[PDB]
């Protein structure tokens, strides 16, 4: 049971994942569109990205989590929509941070990104 922690936002284009973690980084709980109940294309939908944050929001307050860090790793359309679902979730969204890891410049991407 903890009220302050970390909220991660893994927003892809095929899916979104929201992981409620403690301030120590350990995962309190997580959620994805597939867990919200959607499949295939529907997971990456923005509205699904909201609901995944909602369910993740509940499980936070399920452990008394009152306000956490808004850590964002992703670029999908469901990224901005998930930010609301934390904000109106009865949690104090405190630190909205972009942590989309970009290489500098790193490995060869797939064919899909060329």
């Amino acid at each position: 049971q903890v009220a302050s922690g970390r909220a991660y936002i893994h927003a892809s284009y095929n899916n979104t994942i929201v992981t409620i973690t403690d301030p120590d980084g350990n995962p309190i709980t997580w959620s994805s569109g597939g867990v919200i109940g959607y499949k295939g294309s529907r997971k990456g939908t923005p509205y699904a990205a909201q609901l995944a944050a909602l369910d993740a929001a509940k499980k936070a307050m399920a452990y008394g989590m009152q306000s956490v860090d808004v850590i964002v790793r992703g670029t999908g359309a469901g990224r901005e929509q998930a930010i609301r679902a934390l904000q109106a979730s009865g949690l104090q969204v405190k630190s909205i941070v972009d942590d989309t890891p970009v290489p500098h410049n790193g490995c060869r991407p797939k064919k899909k990104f060329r």
Partner: protein, 68 residues
């Protein structure tokens, strides 16, 4: 509104000038464009490599994180 424009005399080669060099990093630690700094290409060229030193020299971040 160039970054250099708000500066007095300073060496672009003084890589230990982390304060002035702090100005020319992005909000995310990226290197600002010339359009933000107005340096010459020669000036800009002096800027980037020197900045890269401070990054390897740890005086400056390779990358920040965006705080919306």
């Amino acid at each position: 509104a160039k970054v250099k424009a708000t500066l007095g005399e300073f060496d672009l080669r003084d890589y230990r000038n982390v304060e002035v060099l702090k100005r020319f990093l992005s909000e995310t630690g990226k290197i600002l464009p010339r359009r933000r700094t107005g340096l010459s290409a020669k000036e800009q060229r002096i800027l980037a490599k020197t900045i890269k030193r401070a990054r390897i020299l740890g005086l400056l971040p390779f990358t920040e994180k965006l705080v919306r």
